[PDB]
């Protein structure tokens, strides 16, 4: 899985 660009470090 991959997070939305720029949200990859959201908790």
């Amino acid at each position: 899985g991959v997070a939305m660009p720029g949200a990859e470090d959201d908790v």
Partner: antibody, heavy 119, light 108 residues
Framework: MKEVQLVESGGGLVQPGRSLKLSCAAS????????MAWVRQTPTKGLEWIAS????????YYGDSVKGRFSISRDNAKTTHYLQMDSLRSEDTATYYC??????????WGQGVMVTVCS | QFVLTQPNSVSTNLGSTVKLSCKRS????????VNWYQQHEGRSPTTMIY?????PDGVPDRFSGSIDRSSNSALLTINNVQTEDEADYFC????????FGGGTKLTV
């Protein structure tokens, strides 16, 4: 139990080629636990994503429109993030919204601030 | 980078069921999460659906999202439409960049 609130400041009128800095003050959550973003809107062109900056502030992303002209940053000890806008163009006229991310989407949005670039 | 295509305008009668469509141009609609935002005239967008089909608290049950892979599209369904639902609706997804559909203006 806290209501999340994002508050843009800055913007207004500006000449082309010149610069403007937008601010977003964020409240209601642990600021450095979440990415922040800027999305702009016009009545005919809809929403366009402009820039994003990761939670720790070490990674920035930009839409095609603004690559190399806009720079996004954040001051975590101030719960605020910024959009520095250089080399402004007439077609940058838009309502600019700040937004918070929650992994896979934008969960809360600002009020929107109007930026008017003169011909 | 793909595009998300929504009809410009949709009309329905009150109490009916309306299906707002969001077609992805290249690649699979099911590859990345689809989210839907509502924007009333003069207001900020607010989340109606996140992660394809989850309702934020305070969003009424009659809003529901889904993914129709056969037409490579996402669907925002509104059951028993009220006049308060008249707004602009944007779908949203991503891959390497962030993509918004053009928005569907709902009238009733």
């Amino acid at each position: 139990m806290k209501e999340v609130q994002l508050v843009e400041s800055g913007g207004g009128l500006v000449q082309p080629g010149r610069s403007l800095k937008l601010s977003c003050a964020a409240s209601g959550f642990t600021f450095s636990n979440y990415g922040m973003a800027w999305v702009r809107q016009t009545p005919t062109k809809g929403l366009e994503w402009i820039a994003s900056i990761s939670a720790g502030g070490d990674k920035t992303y930009y839409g095609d429109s603004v690559k190399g002209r806009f720079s996004i940053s954040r001051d975590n000890a101030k719960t605020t993030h910024y959009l520095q806008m250089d080399s402004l163009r007439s077609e940058d006229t838009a309502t600019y919204y700040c937004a918070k991310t929650s992994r896979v989407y934008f969960d809360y949005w600002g009020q929107g601030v109007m930026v008017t670039v003169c011909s | 980078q793909f595009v998300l295509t929504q009809p410009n305008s949709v009309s329905t009668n009150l109490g009916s069921t309306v299906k707002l469509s969001c077609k992805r141009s290249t690649g699979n609609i099911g590859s990345n999460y689809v989210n839907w935002y509502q924007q009333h005239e003069g207001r900020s967008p607010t989340t109606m659906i996140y992660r394809d089909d989850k309702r934020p608290d305070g969003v009424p049950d009659r809003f529901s999202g889904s993914i129709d892979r056969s037409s490579n599209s996402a669907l925002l369904t509104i059951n028993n439409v009220q006049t308060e639902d008249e707004a602009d609706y944007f779908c949203h997804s991503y891959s390497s960049g962030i993509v918004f559909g053009g928005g569907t203006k709902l009238t009733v």
